[PDB]
Amino acid sequence: DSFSLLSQITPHQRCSFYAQVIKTWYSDKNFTLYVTDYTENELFFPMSPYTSSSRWRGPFGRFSIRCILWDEHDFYCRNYIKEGDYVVMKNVRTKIDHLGYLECILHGDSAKRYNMSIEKVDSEEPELNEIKSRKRLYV
DNA sequence: CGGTTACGGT
């Protein structure tokens, strides 16, 4: 395995990356994260700063990806991963939604076939240094 | 195998 920047991922592959969590949304069916590493991907949604009433404060344009967490991923993260946390996501699956946008999915995997995981990354870990340096450019 | 659209703020 190896890590990718978000600018480097493509649909229908397995990948791993470090990212900052911008937004979380829990539902009765799953847990959703919106994450960024401040690199651009042509298949990300172009987030608009002109929206009336959004709590989104950036990044704007094609800089964030939605991650849908199911089952044990959902139950583990839903009361744990917070807006602002840094995460490392390993061996997650990518797909394209019905409108053509890249999305990341963590399906239940009782059978431990894929060694898929998400964990919180301490803010001071040097692995996060490029994320922080790129974030400055947009800040 | 789910769930839909960049909000909502549960």
Swiss-Prot record:
Homology family: Belongs to the telombin family.
Subunit structure: Self-associates. Interacts with ccq1, poz1 and tpz1.
Location within or outside the cell: Nucleus; Chromosome, Telomere
The gene coding this protein: pot1
Species for this entry: Schizosaccharomyces pombe (strain 972 / ATCC 24843)
Signal peptide: none
Protein name: Protection of telomeres protein 1
Protein task: Single-stranded telomeric DNA-binding protein that is required to protect the 3'-end telomeric overhang. It binds the consensus sequence 5'-GGTTAC-3'. Regulates telomerase and telomere length.
